[PDB]
Design a binder for this molecule. Structure first.
Ligand code: W0F
Ligand code: MG
Ligand code: ZN
Ligand code: ZN
Ligand code: ZN
Lengths: 8, 528, 67, 428, 82, 49, 115, 49, 44, 257
RNA sequence: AACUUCAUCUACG
């Protein structure tokens, strides 16, 4: 829910 | 069939022999208790009255056991049964049995569980051996098991409706085995990663960070009140750091009395400038970062999860490796008690004012988002005009997605950094993040600046409808808003499309957790 | 179900004020002005009347078991 | 405006939603048609001429907040919470105690919980009106301080005010109903409701059979402690066998209603309902409307709780450490809006996508009533009287008492009953 | 085995200490004569701990080597882990 | 519920306005049990003649 | 079911002493007073009044456990002074202060009324 | 007569249908009760779509 | 004992092993009626 | 080495409220006086209920709870009445308790509001602060409430029904000069009613040598005890607790000797 | 001095 590399 | 009786889980071999339901076990909800020690557990009176421990009548304990037998099952510190030498179990619950109340050596009084009993405490799943630990019983009012908060991390337990199983050893031999092999102070350091399993956590961690700042100065009455909760205190008040104009001790000076023996440790605070070590003021550290404990005295530094947390080389780990497990238990308990009372003085909170940032900060966040959206628009125009060229190993679609993701992630990071610059010293989000008690800089950033890109299956929100994400967006829109980027913060509030995309991301996370449990469980069973 | 005697937070008697609150609401008074007229000052006591749902009137519709 | 004016006069104007559909103003669209329709979330923001995103909108959403369901519609400011927290709140709102139905007295349902003093939320969503949450609310508004007081709110637990609990705060009634049917299976073997006799009936127990009336059924209004005999049923033995029902262990209630009827078969059928009034304990579970729950860590009296200058002591103290990782800012906004509503006398509007209710506007409204903009308050330590150095966030938040209570979960075993096949301790 | 050719560790392992202490505790609780002069200690486990510290527990541990052989180490001979 | 595939459980874009995004059970049934949105209606059926 | 009765908070059960005095061996001229069935109300008053005394080197109080009802007051005094005497003098001083407060509050009441 | 069909409460064939809240109270039924369930063997059962 | 009727709310006395039907209304749901012995409630 | 001499100035005195100021006193003494206001002032409230007939919608223990929360005039005889534990007689008697009776039936069609006025006391001095009324229950036609209650002396430590006060407002250092609370932004914070600062100055200058003094109280009565006598009884009760403590301490010191 | 099983579903961390 954050970014592509983070968390969903 | 006979095969089905013996075959799987719930079969004889696995459901009845490898594991089985056992007596002398109690399950109930757990609630916190900062006042209990690490090894102590809080047991309700009813659970302690049902469970019993058989004690052999000896000449030295015959009087106490006979008093317990006289009290009987009704009065709480009593005995439920009397097992004779023949094995006949006189029942103290049913009728006085005045002739059968007599005790001689060799009889076994099944007394009720009392303070000081050793009991195994368990939480499911028992992923590692720290999930079953030996605790010393203390009987407290009300109906919940009460455990120290430093012991929550090994059990993976939070007091939000969790329950814990309790198994009472029934023999002196197995009681000694539990006490030595599995006592909580003996389980402090895990063999899995040669780190302590337990550390200071939650309120105590934040209050320790605040307590060990340079600014904290304690007057005479506060010092005496805090020294009241220090069990290992020698009874001698340290000479205050500031004798004149008024006698004022320091938080570090009092925490130095907590640190046991003579422990030597050097750590660094989370907000340690990388420049300080290379440049001047190496040992002065303008920010009071770094942590130096010499001769068991905190010379300088602010403690956080790096010093008092579950990590190798921590003050807790060095205390275990140097002073022993009993003294380390006392160390944990004293930290919790005196720092919790200082927290009663100073206090801690979270409010809306923590989420609010400066007007300039909000303006900068908005400008960054505008620039990023413009750059994504430019990239989309390059792609449409076929100027874009594929990155090696990637298709034009993949390289376009990667470029857009890079732009959006850089904008998100810049907005997060601006929000974090806005944070004051008094900000409590920042206090919890710096202490390491809870939260992360990602959470602060999402709260204050930008929730960020919502991604499902490692890609931006898919074109679930025909060539568009939602019916509100026009077909073939690859811009940030269409594909899931949420520019509003949680405080600002998500717009409806951002709300749905955020729901998609959260759903993916929940599905991941639920699916993960079973595969990991199967792997663990195979390995064992 | 019925207006609690005493505000939970402080303990000021709010049980006698529900009927007067309803009457003042019927008069014309806004909820805040009626709450002020009744003497409720702290937001703890104003929560008691403001958030109260009177279900006793709906339960009184059902006929009694013994008449 | 013609349609909206006629609908506003809905009753005694005989204009309804079906007339709105017949006029062609609204239309029903399914997913396949949603694939071929250009929608606007709002008329003003989207239909009106601006930098032209789309100039071919074919439909407009009536209101975005309708994308939520029944349980998620009670969440106030749901767009300000993390997404998993709204799922958690839906699940927990299915478990809140309230007045489930108004005819609860007539119904004899096993395991019914009803709350003494339900209150409607001070901060409420508009769609709640169509969920009948005002009519049958579940939960109470409570003064909540987000503070670390004595360490008993750590992790996810909650400190509670024992004086408030003593004044009726979150007190509930638990009704357990027991059914027993006398039946004849063999021609000479029958079951009869009667008070079992020690000599006449072979099977008996220590449990007191005196409370049973002549018919074999306890009369209403009799206190029944755990393992007492609610219904006395004896079977002729081809002297008699005792099949009498007993209370569930630790029920400790008072009989409410005893009904005696005839079932479809024509046999006598008896239902007995038992009241147990459950006061909040230090194991019971309470949750906000924002997906963060917790057991009651400890209960302090009003003398011990921290107090403001006005004399207000929080009903509930929740740990601040819950907020940051979960990012349930809707909780903080709800506390601020509840403070504003309780001082103003209105009921706050927490519809998900209002766009007319910022946090700054709520803060400015709170400033007018004599409080800090952000809702912080100078709290005095209850034990020592000294001001707490950090000003503490206090406000009225709506809390729900979940059905999970410690008394139902506490259990212990010591050489009890054992299964026949495995000869191992039993389950449950 | 003999006093010579003892290959196992001189230090008493944690498991040996646990089992020896529990066994001695149970014996003391079963009216077994107590070697050390208890200083008003009436708990069998505490008395066994006191004997272990004084190296007066009358038990010899037989450690089985994986080849099938055994070595008899007196509790006094072993070095107490704690 | 036994199937561990994370495809049928995920909140699809077409659920917008017709199934609640937030309200789902957690456990083996994440995303498999759903709840209607407030304004959602389900067709009752009609004769195509 | 495990809820303690309310009267346990302040009512001594039979065979319970209100005050038990145990000397503190770690330091000379120090004592530890354990008051049963008492709370912060008395503990904080006594600790403050003991702090006012110049010959009291240390004065502190603690509730060992919130669920249980007990107060532990450590008092360390200078040589030529006894901690028990310090405790008695603290109590008498508090009593005199409270009686003076009562008299002046009654006078203030009578003056606010009747004029 | 070929059988008996359970009747969904407050449907067109339920006795409670078309009754004002006063009449529902006379029958000891809640005016606010939604209906949409069957009473089978004395238990309320809800068909899940 | 004496059972109050579910519908007409008239007390009728039904002996053991007798069908549960109120006289003058015929309703088949009776209620046991409150006990004579009195239980003390602490107002707490 | 001796206790300070405190001074009291009463600013407001109304049948429901006492606003006073205590000067030259310690923070601990002031806070514990407030604490005794809340929890250790004896009062009279119903603690025994026996419901002969309750056909109301509210169950019996709900009615008992509401009856207990009803305040009762305890101005004079609460000092005369004895605790039930102290009284020699078994159960309850005129010296240890006061009897109340409620016999209400809704014969009329209109809903009958059972109020505290319907409670009838055997002794005139204790009345349910009726001289609207607290609503105990609403009775539909054909519904009846009959009960007998016994009211006993007690203090709020036992139960919040015995709290004599509604809200005790306690404030010290109205302008932050001891810096016991450190404001992150002092200007945003509203001024206290007792504040003497000018509008420009948010906080008074830090006083290094200051000590908390001049405590401000606003004690609001629940109506059972007059607000003046709440404060007087609290002072006397705290003095009695201290004197009992001193007696036990002297006895144990003699025992040690 | 003392109450079966299956099966399903629903919840709990
Ligand atoms: C943290 O991990 C725990 C454990 O792993 C244990 N657990 C829970 N459910 C299961 C399950 O189905 N199967 C297995 N094997 N274990 C399970 O529960 C996990 C977390 O779950 P959550 O994520 O809901 O915890 P919140 O973050 O939600 O805590 P709030 O703020 O409510 O107190
Ligand atoms: Mg949990
Ligand atoms: Zn109030
Ligand atoms: Zn009838
Ligand atoms: Zn008497």
């Amino acid at each position: 829910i954050w970014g592509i590399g983070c968390n969903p | 069939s006979l095969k089905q009786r013996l075959k799987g889980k719930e079969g004889r071999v696995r459901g009845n022999l490898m594991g089985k339901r056992v007596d002398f076990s109690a399950r109930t909800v757990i609630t916190p208790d900062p006042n209990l020690s690490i090894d102590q557990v809080g047991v309700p009176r009813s659970i302690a009255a049902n469970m019993t421990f058989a004690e052999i009548v000896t000449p030295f304990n015959i009087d106490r056991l006979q008093e317990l037998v006289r009290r009987g099952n009704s009065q709480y510190p009593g005995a439920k049964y009397i097992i004779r030498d023949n094995g006949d179990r006189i029942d103290l619950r049913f009728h006085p049995k005045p002739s059968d109340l007599h005790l001689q050596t060799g009889y076994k009084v099944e007394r009720h569980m009392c303070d000081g009993d050793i009991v195994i405490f368990n939480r499911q799943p028992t992923l590692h051996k720290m999930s079953m630990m030996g605790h010393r019983v203390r009987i407290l009012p009300w109906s919940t098991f009460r455990l120290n908060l430093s012991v929550t991390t090994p059990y993976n337990a939070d007091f939000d409706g969790d329950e814990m199983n309790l198994h009472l050893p029934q023999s002196l031999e197995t009681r000694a085995e539990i006490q030595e092999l599995a006592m909580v102070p003996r389980m402090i350091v895990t063999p899995q990663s040669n780190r302590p399993v337990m550390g200071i956590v939650q309120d105590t961690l934040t209050a320790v960070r605040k307590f060990t700042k340079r600014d904290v100065f304690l007057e005479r009455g506060e010092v005496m009140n805090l020294l009241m909760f220090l069990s290992t205190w020698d009874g001698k008040v340290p000479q205050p750091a500031i004798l004149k104009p008024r006698p004022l001790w320091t938080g570090k000076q009092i925490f130095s009395l907590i640190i046991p023996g003579h422990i030597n440790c050097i750590r660094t605070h989370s907000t340690h400038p990388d420049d300080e070590d290379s440049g001047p003021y190496k040992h002065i550290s303008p920010g009071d970062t770094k942590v130096v404990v010499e001769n068991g005295e905190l010379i300088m530094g602010i403690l956080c999860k790096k010093s008092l947390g579950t990590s190798a080389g921590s003050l807790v780990h060095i205390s275990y490796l140097e002073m022993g497990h009993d003294i380390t238990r006392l160390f944990y308990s004293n930290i919790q008690t005196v720092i919790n009372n200082w927290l009663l003085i100073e206090g801690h909170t979270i409010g809306i004012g923590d989420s609010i940032a400066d007007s300039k900060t909000y303006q900068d966040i908005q400008n960054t988002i505008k620039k990023a959206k413009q750059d994504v628009i430019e990239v989309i125009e390059k792609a449409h005009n076929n100027e874009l060229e594929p990155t090696p190993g990637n298709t034009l679609r993949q390289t376009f997605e990667n470029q857009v993701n890079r732009i959006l992630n850089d904008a998100r990071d810049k907005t997060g950094s601006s929000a974090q610059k806005s944070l004051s010293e008094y900000n409590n989000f920042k206090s919890m993040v710096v202490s390491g008690a809870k939260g992360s800089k990602i959470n602060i950033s999402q709260v204050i600046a930008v929730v960020g890109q919502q991604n499902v299956e490692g890609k931006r929100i898919p074109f679930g409808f025909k060539h568009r994400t939602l019916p509100h967006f026009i077909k073939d829109d690859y811009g940030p808003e269409s594909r899931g980027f949420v520019e509003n913060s949680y405080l600002a509030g998500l717009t409806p499309t951002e709300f749905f995309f955020h729901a998609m991301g959260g759903r993916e996370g929940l599905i991941d957790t639920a699916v993960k449990t079973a595969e990991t469980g199967y792997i663990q069973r195979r390995l064992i | 179900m019925i207006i609690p005697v005493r505000c939970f937070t402080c303990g000021k008697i709010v049980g006698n004020k529900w009927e007067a609150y309803l009457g003042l609401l019927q008069a014309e008074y806004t909820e805040g002005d009626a709450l002020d007229a009744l003497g409720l000052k702290r937001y703890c006591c104003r929560r008691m009347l403001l958030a109260h749902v009177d279900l006793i009137e709906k339960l009184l519709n059902y006929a009694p078991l013994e008449k | 405006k013609r349609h909206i004016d006629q609908l506003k006069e809905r009753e005694y104007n005989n204009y309804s939603w079906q007339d709105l559909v017949a006029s062609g103003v609204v239309e029903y669209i399914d997913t396949l048609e949603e694939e071929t329709v250009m929608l606007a979330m709002t008329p003003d923001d989207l239909q009106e001429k601006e930098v032209a995103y789309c100039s071919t909108y074919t439909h407009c959403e009536i209101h975005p907040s309708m994308i939520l369901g029944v349980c998620a519609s009670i969440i106030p400011f749901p767009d300000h919470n993390q997404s998993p927290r709204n799922t958690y709140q839906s699940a927990m709102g299915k478990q809140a105690m309230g007045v489930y139905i108004t005819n609860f007295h007539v119904r004899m349902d096993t395991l019914a919980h009803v709350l003494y003093y339900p209150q409607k939320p001070l901060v409420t969503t508009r769609s709640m009106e169509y969920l009948r949450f005002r009519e049958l609310p579940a939960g109470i508004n409570s003064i909540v301080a987000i503070a670390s007081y004595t360490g008993y709110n750590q992790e996810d637990s909650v400190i509670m005010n024992r004086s408030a609990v003593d004044r009726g705060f979150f007190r509930s009634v638990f009704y357990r109903s027991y059914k027993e049917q006398e039946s004849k299976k063999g021609f000479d073997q029958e079951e009869v409701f009667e008070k079992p006799t020690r000599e006449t009936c072979q099977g008996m127990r220590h449990a007191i059979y005196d409370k049973l009336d002549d018919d074999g059924l306890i009369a209403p209004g009799v206190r029944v402690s755990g393992d007492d005999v609610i219904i006395g049923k004896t079977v002729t033995l081809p002297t008699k066998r005792d099949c009498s029902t007993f209370l569930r262990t630790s029920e400790t209630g008072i009989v409410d209603q005893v009904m005696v009827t005839l079932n479809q078969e024509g046999y006598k059928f008896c239902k007995i309902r038992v009241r147990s009034v459950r006061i909040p304990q230090i194991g019971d579970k309470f949750a906000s409307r924002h997906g963060q729950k917790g057991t009651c860590g400890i209960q302090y009296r009003q003398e011990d709780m921290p107090f403001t200058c006005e004399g207000i002591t929080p009903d509930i103290i929740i740990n601040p450490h819950a907020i940051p990782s979960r990012m349930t800012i809707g909780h903080l906004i709800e506390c601020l809006q509840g403070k504003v509503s309780a001082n103003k006398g209105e009921i706050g509007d927490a519809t998900p996508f209002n766009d007319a209710v910022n946090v700054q506007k709520i803060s400015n409204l709170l400033s007018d009533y004599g409080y800090h903009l952000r809702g912080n308050e100078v709290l005095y330590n209850g034990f020592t009287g000294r001001k707490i150095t950090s000003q503490i966030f206090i406000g009225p938040t709506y809390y729900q008492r979940l059905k999970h209570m410690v008394d139902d979960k506490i259990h212990s075993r010591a050489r009890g009953p054992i299964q026949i096949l495995n000869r191992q301790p039993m389950e449950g | 085995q003999a006093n010579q050719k003892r290959i196992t560790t001189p230090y008493m392992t944690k498991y040996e200490r646990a089992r020896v202490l529990g066994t001695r505790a149970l014996q003391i609780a079963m009216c077994a004569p107590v070697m050390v002069e208890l200083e008003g200690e009436t708990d069998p486990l505490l008395i066994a701990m006191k004997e272990l510290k004084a190296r007066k527990i009358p038990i010899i541990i037989r450690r089985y080597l994986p080849d099938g052989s055994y070595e008899d180490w007196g509790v006094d001979e072993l070095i107490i882990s704690d | 519920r036994d199937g561990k595939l994370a495809k049928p459980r995920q909140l699809h874009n077409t659920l917008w306005g017709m199934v609640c995004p937030a309200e789902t059970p957690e456990g083996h049934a994440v995303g498999l049990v759903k709840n209607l949105a407030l304004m959602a209606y389900i067709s009752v059926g009609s004769q195509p003649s | 079911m495990n809820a303690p009765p309310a009267f346990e908070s302040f009512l001594l059960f039979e065979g319970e002493k209100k005050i038990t005095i145990n000397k503190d061996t770690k330091v000379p001229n120090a004592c530890l007073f354990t008051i049963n069935k008492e709370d912060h109300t008395l503990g904080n008053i006594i600790k403050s009044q003991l702090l006012k005394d110049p010959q009291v080197l240390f004065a502190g109080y603690k509730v060992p456990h919130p669920l249980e009802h007990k107060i532990i007051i450590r008092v360390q005094t200078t040589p030529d002074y006894s901690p028990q005497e310090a405790f008695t003098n603290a109590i008498t001083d508090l009593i005199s202060e409270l009686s003076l407060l009562e008299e002046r509050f009654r006078v203030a009441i009578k003056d606010k009324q009747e004029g | 007569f070929i059988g008996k069909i359970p009747i969904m409460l407050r449907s067109t064939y339920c006795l409670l249908n078309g009754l004002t809240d006063r009449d529902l109270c006379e029958l000891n039924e809640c005016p606010l009760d939604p209906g949409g369930y069957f009473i089978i063997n004395g238990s309320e059962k809800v068909l899940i779509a | 004992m004496i059972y109050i009727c579910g519908e007409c709310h008239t007390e009728n006395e039904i002996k053991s092993r007798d069908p549960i039907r109120c006289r003058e209304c015929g309703y088949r749901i009776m209620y046991k009626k409150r006990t004579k012995r009195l239980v003390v409630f602490d107002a707490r | 080495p001796y206790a300070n001499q405190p001074t009291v100035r009463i600013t407001e005195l109304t049948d429901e409220n006492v606003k006073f100021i205590i000067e030259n006193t310690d923070l601990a003494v002031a806070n514990s006086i407030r604490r005794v206001f809340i929890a250790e002032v004896p009062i009279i409230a119903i603690d025994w209920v026996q419901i002969d007939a309750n056909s109301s919608v509210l169950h019996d223990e709900f009615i008992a709870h509401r009856l207990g929360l009803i305040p009762l005039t305890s101005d004079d005889i609460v000092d005369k009445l004895q605790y039930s534990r102290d009284c020699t007689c078994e159960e309850f008697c005129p010296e240890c308790s006061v009897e109340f009776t409620l016999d209400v039936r809704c014969n009329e069609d209109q809903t009958r509001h059972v109020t505290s006025r319907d409670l009838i006391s055997n002794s005139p001095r204790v009345i349910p602060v009726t001289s609207d009324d607290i609503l105990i229950v609403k009775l539909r036609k054909g519904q009846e409430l009959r009960l007998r209650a016994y009211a006993k002396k007690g203090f709020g430590k036992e139960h919040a029904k015995w709290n004599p006060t509604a809200g005790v407002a306690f404030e010290y250092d109205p302008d932050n000069a001891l810096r016991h609370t450190v404001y992150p932004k002092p200007e945003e914070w509203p001024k206290s009613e007792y504040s003497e600062l000018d509008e420009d100055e948010s906080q008074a200058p830090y006083d290094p040598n200051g000590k908390p003094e001049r405590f401000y109280y606003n004690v609001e009565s629940c109506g059972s005890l007059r607000p003046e006598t709440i404060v007087l009884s609290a002072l006397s009760g705290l003095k009695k607790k201290l004197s009992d403590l001193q007696t036990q301490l002297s006895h144990e010191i003699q025992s040690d000797v």
